[PDB]
Design a binder for this molecule. Structure first.
Ligand SMILES: CCCCCCCCCO[C@@H]1O[C@H](CO)[C@@H](O)[C@H](O)[C@H]1O
Ligand SMILES: CCCCCCCCCO[C@@H]1O[C@H](CO)[C@@H](O)[C@H](O)[C@H]1O
Ligand SMILES: CCCCCCCCCO[C@@H]1O[C@H](CO)[C@@H](O)[C@H](O)[C@H]1O
Ligand SMILES: CCCCCCCCCO[C@@H]1O[C@H](CO)[C@@H](O)[C@H](O)[C@H]1O
Ligand SMILES: CCCCCCCCCO[C@@H]1O[C@H](CO)[C@@H](O)[C@H](O)[C@H]1O
Ligand SMILES: CCCCCCCCCO[C@@H]1O[C@H](CO)[C@@H](O)[C@H](O)[C@H]1O
Ligand SMILES: CCCCCCCCCO[C@@H]1O[C@H](CO)[C@@H](O)[C@H](O)[C@H]1O
Ligand SMILES: CCCCCCCCCO[C@@H]1O[C@H](CO)[C@@H](O)[C@H](O)[C@H]1O
Ligand SMILES: CCCCCCCCCO[C@@H]1O[C@H](CO)[C@@H](O)[C@H](O)[C@H]1O
Ligand SMILES: CCCCCCCCCO[C@@H]1O[C@H](CO)[C@@H](O)[C@H](O)[C@H]1O
Ligand SMILES: CCCCCCCCCO[C@@H]1O[C@H](CO)[C@@H](O)[C@H](O)[C@H]1O
Ligand SMILES: CCCCCCCCCO[C@@H]1O[C@H](CO)[C@@H](O)[C@H](O)[C@H]1O
Lengths: 455, 455, 455
């Protein structure tokens, strides 16, 4: 009544209009497909960080990726989607208008080429990838119940505001003119600086794997690193290629850029390791470099000329390779790989987007931007820096607050203090904890949960 | 001559008309993509059931998934497609009109938005997923030749009739008004009750892994469980999302429901295990719960409001969790996991579809239904029960008949009787069977086929 | 100025026209999706050949697949794309017009239904699959630096010319009328005969695994074989299905053919092994047969009637099964599996395409061909043979030249001579090479690179 297209609410009355008429069906099919591709990046992250670990994590990140997929999907449905994409938000956050996905259907989303329900599906996958990045960063000696509560809270008060600033209809970064093609800020810079908060507050200090004369690379499982990298690169075609919101050739241009940045990042990191080790070929390095390039090109993929995409592989690979060395300086391992690749890689990529963004690339699908230094738009670099600094500051500060607030509550403490924690070898001698004898997650039906030595 | 569109046979003469003009190209692209996604669910099933096993299966289900993909594709081509989708069937079964895919081309399929050849591709994947569910259920001490013959026969006389009733142009369940969005009946309820027939006739009784004080969860490979769950959830976006037959936003709505049911099922099953174990976190349970939710939402995904999808995770997870305990009561392990997840999960999901189906959800793409209890259509619940009971009865009874008929034929007996079966350790002492020494499927070039101790 | 559609260069001025208007958006979405599917075939190849190996390769092919993805993407960007698809080539090769992808944007590609940038993305994946086939063939005792240089050179002077002849606007095989639906020549026949050059020049002679009374199948990792086969079959829907360049039902017809050829190839090879071993069931054989069928149907998938696709499984499976036996005759293992499956399978499939190609199948999307023997076009078989012989001759001869030229240059020698190579067990006793003690690529951060025993 009339139930005709309004652009608001459900978008119209399904008994009176065909809501699908508002959209190009091929745009919808590509974004649906891209959503499925981003989903498989979730276990990709878990495999990557499980495999790279220089320490025996009690919690399997391959499995924790499924836990994160579950917690993030629930959070997104409950209020995460609404806090980012409620068509009625301020400049800093959305509302609870779409609590439990109420009225999320056929109105054109903030990306007008797809309906709200499909944009919900697609963007929810980005929240889930960020959730497993966070769980991976904070996995060492994590308690599962508190971790699940942490992820729910963290998505709500760290991810959702940063996502709103970046993608929301009235988000202040959107208004300012900052560029972030595929959500490098909300996903990579954000998780990376939240990881750093974890490292500096909850991470083990004077860590034996980061102390003195120790190997920079000492992986738990190279096959897991490689499988994770495979799922990440495969899924990243949806992550970046879908960020146009359409079936135009800007989507395919972004995929060409994505592939070339990954390729040049992998080769660059491996070449850097070759020079720095005096001629060794680094198995872990090739994979880390591909990830550095993928992260680097994320804010840029639909904005920069193809030939510049090689720079988004080379420069993040070099800078991230050296950022990893800060683990030796601080003597901290926990959380630091996620910071180095996603935090530093995300910052570098975001900065370089201000240099290389071009109006003629965005215009491939009619997207209008002033451009970067390629168009003599010098001020763009300042907009990029404003975004990167705001994301880093909010993520680091608020993540610190959550971690410490939960730490002060006995039943919510994410990681027990070392002096209250019982040894797995001692638990295994007790009848009611005999299952701690199987310290191998391949055969154990139960998570080897940290137990307080007061029971 | 005139070779113009007829809606029958090949659909028209390719030299005179463009058969593609009858279809929206984006509808076709989504269903082609969804077909590829369902294909990877085949090894997903094999990985899941290989990993969950409390017993050392001689046959690797990861590998058997490829065998099933081969047998099912051949059966479908030969006559399986025709027995379900020959446009000229009765109310109970199709015909051999499309034997060897004769004349399967460009006529609109029973799903009018895609041509016969594409519907053939898509629906063949559902047959193959059901084949590996059956092979998984019946894998313990299976002989490979007889298993392949069994799958061919089973697809023909169990899967194909149930699929016809559900999807066929004149299928009696279609006519009755029963709802089954993505083939929960033909795939999950069917394989589950066929699994139960296997359990009760060919399964080992008084099984040491299901007898007395034994662990409910004791997996062969947690990494295999997790990898299988990953492939299943990823592919299920095609399984459910493609069941609209189109590129409309009902496809994406169904994907949102699919993700939320998996997420809530995983969390629910793990929470149930936490209460029942006195505080342990169940690795296997999270995965089983995700599968329970995916199975649960299958008959419902394109029919129920988004907020109700959480019920399709919670309720099947709880009921299936307790159904697994029946293995202890019966002291039977073989085949029972497939029954618990797919049979019970499928029954529960089908029943709840009668409660929660809504005309306004179906109408998102113009699909007309009376609805469920959400629309005060009380009779819908009875239609659902008629379907579930018919599927369970046909599958259990006919599967029983096939298993027992083959059992009475020496060269077709699927599983040897324990007293006619030689020990692998004894075979390994014989020169012509020395390869039985390698009881590890990771390195052995040959299937460790059960051998009769009469040679 | 006018910047309107020209069909050349960038295709038009993005500030004046919408380049996307020239294309059906659904055609673009399918080819973008198919590109992502072909990408995952890259690690599929690496997993397959790592797993099948009868020898302990020091270089992990699962990991080397990522290296190949990187080298091939860079080569393709640099000049590979231009040498195949520069719209201004001769009959034998393209030009450097599109060096570093200059002006590769929105002009219709040689496949007029997609723009240059998307055809670039898609076809680059084929180059990368061929790169990992080559790296796999030549992996035994390979040195990594020289291997990377080799792949770059090989793509440039072996792959690119053969691809031009097959796909290029003025390619001589195109003009002749030879049929090759999905690039069986450039990918499979080519890599297979290049593998044979490797086998005969650099392969180990009188190899203990191929000498005397030794097992035909003795795999390193069955799980790797199966995982590789899964990724290959899944991705092959894009490899073959995308080779129409469009969203028509010829794409889906090609997928039905692809699935049926894989299925019948797997069953055929396993049945052949069953007869030849006196009743054993071959784990490796089922997988090899699926690959033989997939290779076989590649030149044919969009040209042959569905019922004939079973022949493209059966015949290549039988012939390739016996081709593998030539390893015993020659007493050479290295490189020979790639030759047997891709070289022989590719030759057989190409030949049979001349028998079974049908004008009415090509015409499903308006593609005009004279057809094969199915249309009494007898001369087609000669065109097929001209293509197969030219590919085999160029690949074998030029690959031989490259391998031998690099062999004569100390720092480019791909494989050290056995008498200049130090033992891993001896390197491990030296302090600066202690890491050679860990001969297990699952835990070692470094490639166990062959070292000259002159340092
Ligand atoms: C525990 C947290 C309970 C929060 C549930 C309240 O949601 C409400 O729902 C309305 C639409 O559903 C919104 O308009 C409104 O803003 C919001 O307050
Ligand atoms: C443990 C999981 C808890 C989440 C599931 C509860 C979702 C609450 C949403 O409320 C529902 O929203 C509809 C909007 O249309 C209303 O019409 C309906 O009356 C109301 O019931
Ligand atoms: C979706 C939320 C699931 C419940 C989250 C509640 C806060 C964390 C509860 O976990 C706690 O962890 C302890 C092990 O350290 C367990 O001994 C104990 O049983 C449990 O109190
Ligand atoms: C630390 C987070 C800072 C985010 C807000 C700063 C910019 C506010 C712009 O207002 C318009
Ligand atoms: C062994 C089984 C052999 C069955 C092959 C016979 O198929 C026949 O093919 C016709 C169209 O091809 C159909 O019209 C007809 O109904 C069917 O009988
Ligand atoms: C071991 C695999 C056996 C399956 C392969 C045999 C398929 C038999 C199909 O018959 C063919 O159907 C066409 C329909 O158009 C006829 O035109 C053609 O004359 C006829 O030959
Ligand atoms: C596609 C069908 C493939 C053949 C199926 C025929 C029925 C089963 C044959 O397998 C049998 O299994 C025995 C091991 O138990 C083997 O010793 C014996 O060789 C073989 O007689
Ligand atoms: C046990 C299978 C029962 C299926 C047939 C029962 C319903 C027949 C409806 O006819 C109309
Ligand atoms: C090291 C190899 C350096 C080769 C780079 C030269 O590329 C040139 O670029 C032009 C368009 O960019 C082409 O028209 C021209 O043919 C080509 O010669
Ligand atoms: C180690 C990786 C080396 C590859 C990266 C160098 C790519 C060289 C391409 O040249 C660039 O091509 C543009 C075409 O538009 C010109 O406009 C621009 O002026 C020019 O700079
Ligand atoms: C993208 C190209 C990367 C460099 C390729 C240059 C040619 C091969 C160089 O590798 C060589 O391999 C030796 C081990 O055999 C190493 O000891 C030595 O450091 C190095 O000289
Ligand atoms: C050995 C490679 C042979 C390729 C060229 C031979 C055919 C040339 C056709 O000219 C037209």
């Amino acid at each position: 009544m009339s139930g005709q297209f309004t652009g608001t609410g459900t978008g119209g009355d399904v008994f009176k209009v065909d809501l699908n008429e508002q959209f190009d069906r091929a745009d919808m099919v590509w974004i649906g497909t891209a959503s499925v591709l981003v989903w498989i990046m979730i276990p990709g992250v878990g495999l990557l960080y499980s495999g790279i670990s220089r320490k025996k994590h009690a919690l399997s990140l391959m499995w924790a990726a499924l836990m994160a997929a579950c917690v993030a999907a629930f959070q997104w449905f409950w209020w995460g989607y609404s806090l980012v994409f409620a068509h009625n938000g301020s400049v800093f956050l959305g509302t609870l208008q779409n609590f439990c996905l109420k009225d999320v259907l056929g109105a054109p989303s903030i990306v007008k080429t797809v309906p709200d329900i499909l944009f919900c599906l697609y963007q929810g996958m980005f929240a889930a990838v960020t959730a497993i990045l966070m769980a991976g960063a904070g996995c060492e000696r994590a308690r599962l119940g508190p971790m699940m509560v942490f992820l729910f809270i963290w998505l709500t008060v760290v991810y959702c505001p940063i996502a709103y600033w970046t993608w929301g209809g009235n988000g202040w970064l959107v208004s300012l003119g900052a560029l972030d093609f595929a959500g490098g800020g909300p996903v990579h810079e954000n998780s990376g600086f939240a990881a750093l908060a974890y490292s500096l507050w909850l991470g083990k200090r004077h860590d034996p794997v980061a102390k003195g004369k120790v190997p920079k690379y000492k992986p738990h499982s190279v096959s897991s690193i490689v499988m994770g990298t495979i799922f990440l690169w495969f899924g990243w075609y949806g992550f970046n290629g879908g960020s146009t919101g359409n079936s135009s050739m800007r989507s395919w241009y972004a995929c060409v850029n994505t592939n070339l940045a990954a390729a040049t990042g992998g080769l660059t990191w491996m070449l850097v390791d070759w020079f720095r080790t005096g001629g060794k070929w680094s198995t872990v390095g090739l994979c880390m470099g591909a990830i550095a390039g993928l992260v680097g090109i994320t804010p840029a993929a639909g904005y920069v000329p193809v030939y510049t995409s090689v720079i988004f592989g080379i420069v993040p690979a070099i800078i991230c390779n050296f950022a990893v060395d800060l683990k030796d300086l601080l003597q901290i391992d926990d959380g630091m790989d996620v910071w180095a690749l996603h935090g530093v890689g995300g910052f570098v990529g975001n900065f370089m987007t201000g240099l290389f963004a071009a109006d003629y690339v965005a215009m491939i699908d009619g997207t209008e931007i002033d451009g970067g230094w390629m168009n003599h738009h010098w001020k763009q670099l300042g907009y990029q820096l404003a975004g990167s600094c705001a994301v880093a500051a909010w993520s680091f500060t608020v993540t610190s607050i959550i971690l410490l607030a939960m730490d002060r509550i006995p039943f919510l403490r994410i990681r027990l203090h070392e002096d209250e924690e019982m040894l797995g070898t001692d638990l295994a001698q007790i009848g009611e904890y005999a299952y701690y004898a199987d310290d191998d997650p391949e055969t154990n039906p139960y998570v080897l949960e940290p137990i307080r030595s007061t029971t």
